Coordinates of all heavy atoms in Angstrom, one line a residue:
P1 N -12.0 20.0 -2.0 CA -11.9 18.9 -1.1 C -12.5 19.2 0.3 O -12.1 20.4 0.8 CB -10.6 18.4 -1.2 CG -9.8 19.6 -1.6 CD -10.7 20.4 -2.6
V2 N -13.2 18.3 1.0 CA -13.7 18.6 2.2 C -12.6 18.6 3.3 O -11.5 18.0 3.1 CB -14.8 17.6 2.6 CG1 -15.5 17.9 3.9 CG2 -15.8 17.5 1.5
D3 N -12.8 19.5 4.3 CA -11.8 19.6 5.3 C -11.4 18.3 6.1 O -12.3 17.5 6.1 CB -12.3 20.8 6.4 CG -13.5 20.4 7.1 OD1 -14.1 19.3 6.7 OD2 -14.0 21.1 7.9
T4 N -10.2 18.2 6.4 CA -9.7 16.9 7.0 C -9.1 17.0 8.4 O -8.8 16.0 9.0 CB -8.7 16.3 6.1 OG1 -8.2 15.1 6.5 CG2 -7.4 17.3 5.8
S5 N -8.8 18.2 8.8 CA -8.2 18.3 10.2 C -9.1 18.1 11.3 O -8.7 17.8 12.5 CB -7.7 19.8 10.4 OG -8.5 20.7 10.0
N6 N -10.5 18.1 11.1 CA -11.5 17.8 12.0 C -11.9 16.4 12.2 O -12.9 16.1 12.9 CB -12.7 18.6 11.7 CG -13.2 18.5 10.2 OD1 -12.4 18.3 9.3 ND2 -14.5 18.4 10.0
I7 N -11.1 15.5 11.6 CA -11.3 14.0 11.7 C -9.9 13.3 12.1 O -8.9 13.9 11.7 CB -11.9 13.4 10.5 CG1 -11.2 13.8 9.2 CG2 -13.4 13.8 10.4 CD1 -11.6 13.2 8.0
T8 N -10.1 12.1 12.7 CA -8.9 11.4 13.0 C -9.1 9.9 12.7 O -10.2 9.4 12.7 CB -8.5 11.5 14.6 OG1 -8.5 12.9 14.9 CG2 -7.3 10.8 15.0
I9 N -8.0 9.3 12.3 CA -8.0 7.9 11.8 C -8.3 7.0 13.0 O -7.6 7.0 14.0 CB -6.8 7.5 11.1 CG1 -6.6 8.2 9.8 CG2 -6.8 6.0 10.9 CD1 -5.1 8.0 9.2
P10 N -9.3 6.1 12.9 CA -9.5 5.1 14.0 C -8.4 4.1 14.1 O -7.8 3.8 13.1 CB -10.8 4.5 13.6 CG -11.5 5.4 12.6 CD -10.4 6.0 11.9
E11 N -8.1 3.7 15.4 CA -7.1 2.8 15.5 C -7.3 1.4 14.9 O -6.3 0.7 14.5 CB -6.7 2.6 17.0 CG -6.0 3.9 17.5 CD -7.0 4.9 17.9 OE1 -8.3 4.7 17.6 OE2 -6.6 6.1 18.3
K12 N -8.6 1.0 14.8 CA -8.9 -0.4 14.3 C -8.5 -0.5 12.8 O -8.3 -1.5 12.3 CB -10.4 -0.6 14.5 CG -10.7 -1.2 15.9 CD -10.7 -0.1 17.0 CE -11.8 0.8 16.8 NZ -11.8 1.8 17.9
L13 N -8.5 0.7 12.2 CA -8.2 0.8 10.8 C -6.7 0.7 10.4 O -6.4 0.7 9.2 CB -8.8 2.1 10.1 CG -10.3 2.0 10.0 CD1 -10.8 3.3 9.5 CD2 -11.0 0.8 9.4
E14 N -5.8 0.8 11.4 CA -4.4 0.7 11.2 C -4.0 -0.6 10.6 O -3.2 -0.7 9.6 CB -3.6 1.1 12.4 CG -2.2 1.6 12.2 CD -1.2 0.5 11.9 OE1 -1.4 -0.7 12.4 OE2 -0.2 0.7 11.1
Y15 N -4.4 -1.7 11.2 CA -4.2 -3.0 10.6 C -4.7 -3.1 9.1 O -4.1 -3.8 8.3 CB -4.9 -4.1 11.5 CG -4.7 -5.5 11.1 CD1 -3.5 -6.1 11.3 CD2 -5.7 -6.1 10.5 CE1 -3.3 -7.5 10.9 CE2 -5.4 -7.4 10.1 CZ -4.3 -8.1 10.2 OH -4.1 -9.5 9.9
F16 N -5.9 -2.4 9.0 CA -6.5 -2.4 7.6 C -5.5 -1.7 6.6 O -5.3 -2.1 5.5 CB -7.7 -1.7 7.7 CG -8.5 -1.6 6.4 CD1 -9.1 -2.7 6.0 CD2 -8.4 -0.6 5.6 CE1 -9.7 -2.8 4.6 CE2 -9.0 -0.4 4.3 CZ -9.5 -1.6 3.8
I17 N -5.0 -0.6 7.1 CA -4.1 0.2 6.3 C -2.9 -0.6 5.9 O -2.4 -0.7 4.8 CB -3.7 1.5 7.1 CG1 -4.9 2.4 7.2 CG2 -2.6 2.2 6.2 CD1 -4.6 3.9 7.5
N18 N -2.3 -1.3 6.9 CA -1.2 -2.2 6.6 C -1.6 -3.2 5.5 O -1.0 -3.2 4.5 CB -0.8 -3.0 7.9 CG -0.3 -2.1 9.0 OD1 0.0 -0.9 8.7 ND2 0.0 -2.6 10.2
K19 N -2.7 -3.8 5.7 CA -3.2 -5.0 4.8 C -3.3 -4.5 3.3 O -2.7 -5.0 2.4 CB -4.4 -5.6 5.2 CG -4.3 -6.5 6.4 CD -5.5 -7.5 6.5 CE -6.7 -6.7 6.5 NZ -6.9 -5.7 7.6
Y20 N -4.0 -3.3 3.2 CA -4.1 -2.8 1.9 C -2.7 -2.3 1.3 O -2.6 -2.3 0.1 CB -5.1 -1.6 1.9 CG -5.5 -1.3 0.4 CD1 -6.4 -2.0 -0.3 CD2 -5.0 -0.1 -0.2 CE1 -6.7 -1.6 -1.6 CE2 -5.3 0.3 -1.4 CZ -6.1 -0.5 -2.1 OH -6.5 -0.1 -3.4
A21 N -1.9 -1.9 2.2 CA -0.5 -1.6 1.7 C 0.2 -2.8 1.2 O 1.1 -2.7 0.3 CB 0.3 -0.8 2.8
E22 N 0.3 -4.0 1.9 CA 0.9 -5.1 1.3 C 0.1 -5.5 0.0 O 0.7 -5.9 -0.9 CB 0.9 -6.4 2.2 CG 1.8 -6.5 3.4 CD 1.0 -5.8 4.6 OE1 0.0 -5.5 4.5 OE2 1.7 -5.8 5.7
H23 N -1.2 -5.3 -0.1 CA -2.0 -5.5 -1.3 C -1.4 -4.6 -2.4 O -1.1 -5.1 -3.6 CB -3.4 -5.1 -1.1 CG -4.3 -5.4 -2.2 ND1 -4.4 -4.7 -3.3 CD2 -5.3 -6.4 -2.3 CE1 -5.3 -5.3 -4.2 NE2 -5.9 -6.3 -3.6
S24 N -1.2 -3.3 -2.2 CA -0.7 -2.5 -3.3 C 0.8 -2.8 -3.6 O 1.2 -2.9 -4.8 CB -0.7 -1.0 -2.8 OG -0.1 -0.7 -1.5
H25 N 1.7 -3.2 -2.6 CA 3.0 -3.5 -2.9 C 3.0 -4.8 -3.7 O 3.8 -4.9 -4.6 CB 3.8 -3.7 -1.6 CG 5.2 -4.0 -1.8 ND1 6.0 -3.3 -2.8 CD2 6.1 -4.9 -1.2 CE1 7.2 -3.8 -2.6 NE2 7.2 -4.8 -1.8
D26 N 2.2 -5.8 -3.4 CA 2.3 -7.0 -4.1 C 1.7 -6.7 -5.6 O 2.4 -7.3 -6.5 CB 1.3 -8.0 -3.5 CG 1.9 -8.8 -2.4 OD1 3.0 -8.4 -1.9 OD2 1.3 -9.8 -1.9
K27 N 0.7 -6.0 -5.8 CA 0.2 -5.8 -7.1 C 1.4 -4.8 -8.0 O 1.6 -5.1 -9.2 CB -1.0 -5.0 -7.3 CG -1.1 -3.5 -6.9 CD -2.4 -2.8 -7.3 CE -3.5 -3.2 -6.4 NZ -3.4 -2.6 -5.0
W28 N 2.1 -4.0 -7.2 CA 3.1 -3.2 -7.9 C 4.3 -4.1 -8.3 O 4.8 -3.9 -9.3 CB 3.4 -2.1 -7.0 CG 4.6 -1.1 -7.4 CD1 4.5 -0.2 -8.4 CD2 5.8 -0.9 -6.9 NE1 5.7 0.4 -8.6 CE2 6.5 0.1 -7.6 CE3 6.5 -1.4 -5.7 CZ2 7.8 0.6 -7.3 CZ3 7.7 -0.9 -5.4 CH2 8.3 0.0 -6.2
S29 N 4.6 -5.0 -7.3 CA 5.7 -5.9 -7.7 C 5.4 -6.8 -8.8 O 6.1 -6.9 -9.9 CB 6.1 -6.9 -6.5 OG 6.4 -6.0 -5.3
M30 N 4.1 -7.4 -8.9 CA 3.8 -8.3 -10.0 C 3.7 -7.5 -11.2 O 4.2 -8.0 -12.2 CB 2.3 -8.9 -9.7 CG 2.3 -9.9 -8.5 SD 0.6 -10.1 -8.1 CE 0.5 -9.7 -6.4
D31 N 3.2 -6.3 -11.3 CA 2.9 -5.5 -12.5 C 4.2 -5.0 -13.1 O 4.5 -5.1 -14.4 CB 1.8 -4.6 -12.5 CG 2.3 -3.3 -11.7 OD1 3.4 -3.2 -11.3 OD2 1.3 -2.5 -11.5
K32 N 5.2 -4.7 -12.2 CA 6.4 -4.3 -12.7 C 7.3 -5.5 -13.2 O 8.1 -5.4 -14.2 CB 7.2 -3.5 -11.7 CG 7.9 -4.2 -10.6 CD 8.9 -3.5 -9.9 CE 8.2 -2.6 -9.0 NZ 7.4 -3.3 -7.9
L33 N 7.1 -6.6 -12.5 CA 7.7 -7.8 -13.1 C 7.2 -8.2 -14.5 O 8.0 -8.6 -15.4 CB 7.6 -8.9 -12.2 CG 8.3 -8.9 -10.7 CD1 7.8 -10.1 -10.0 CD2 9.8 -8.9 -11.0
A34 N 5.9 -8.0 -14.6 CA 5.3 -8.3 -16.0 C 5.8 -7.2 -17.0 O 6.0 -7.6 -18.2 CB 3.7 -8.2 -16.0
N35 N 5.9 -6.0 -16.6 CA 6.5 -4.9 -17.6 C 7.8 -5.1 -17.9 O 8.4 -4.6 -19.0 CB 6.1 -3.5 -16.9 CG 4.6 -3.2 -17.0 OD1 4.1 -2.8 -15.9 ND2 4.1 -3.3 -18.1
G36 N 8.6 -5.8 -17.0 CA 10.0 -6.0 -17.4 C 11.0 -5.5 -16.3 O 12.2 -5.6 -16.5
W37 N 10.5 -4.9 -15.1 CA 11.4 -4.5 -14.2 C 11.9 -5.7 -13.4 O 11.2 -6.7 -13.1 CB 10.6 -3.7 -13.0 CG 9.9 -2.5 -13.7 CD1 9.0 -2.4 -14.7 CD2 10.2 -1.2 -13.2 NE1 8.6 -1.2 -14.9 CE2 9.3 -0.3 -14.0 CE3 11.0 -0.5 -12.3 CZ2 9.3 1.0 -13.9 CZ3 10.9 0.8 -12.2 CH2 10.1 1.6 -13.0
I38 N 13.3 -5.7 -13.2 CA 14.0 -6.9 -12.8 C 14.2 -6.8 -11.3 O 14.4 -5.7 -10.8 CB 15.4 -7.0 -13.5 CG1 15.1 -6.9 -15.0 CG2 16.1 -8.3 -13.2 CD1 16.5 -6.8 -15.9
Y39 N 14.3 -7.9 -10.6 CA 14.6 -7.9 -9.2 C 15.9 -8.4 -9.0 O 16.5 -9.3 -9.6 CB 13.6 -8.9 -8.5 CG 13.8 -9.0 -7.0 CD1 13.7 -7.9 -6.2 CD2 14.1 -10.3 -6.4 CE1 13.9 -7.9 -4.8 CE2 14.2 -10.3 -5.0 CZ 14.1 -9.1 -4.2 OH 14.3 -9.2 -2.9
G40 N 16.6 -7.7 -7.9 CA 18.0 -8.0 -7.7 C 18.4 -7.5 -6.3 O 17.5 -7.1 -5.4
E41 N 19.6 -7.4 -5.9 CA 20.2 -6.9 -4.6 C 20.8 -5.5 -4.7 O 21.2 -5.0 -3.8 CB 21.2 -8.0 -4.1 CG 20.6 -9.3 -3.8 CD 20.5 -10.2 -5.0 OE1 20.9 -9.8 -6.0 OE2 20.0 -11.3 -4.9
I42 N 20.8 -4.9 -6.0 CA 21.3 -3.6 -6.1 C 20.3 -2.8 -6.8 O 19.5 -3.2 -7.4 CB 22.7 -3.6 -7.0 CG1 22.5 -4.3 -8.3 CG2 23.8 -4.4 -6.2 CD1 23.6 -4.1 -9.3

């Protein structure tokens, strides 16, 4: 894998990272609900 210390995340992409993270959380919630994972408070 190519080296990564020589680059830095642009600040404009932080909002983007957030948005794709709600995207992933939403799909994970939906697909575990489909598979049978139950939602609760414990």
Side-chain angles (χ1 to χ4, degrees):
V2 184
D3 57 355
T4 181
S5 48
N6 48 325
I7 50 176
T8 305
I9 294 171
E11 289 81 4
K12 277 74 69 177
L13 295 178
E14 201 280 330
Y15 182 76
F16 182 76
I17 298 202
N18 293 356
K19 286 200 302 309
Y20 192 75
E22 293 84 4
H23 188 284
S24 59
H25 182 44
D26 275 12
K27 74 165 77 71
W28 181 65
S29 301
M30 297 164 232
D31 72 5
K32 74 169 75 68
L33 294 174
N35 291 125
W37 304 59
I38 310 169
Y39 181 58
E41 295 84 4
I42 59 174

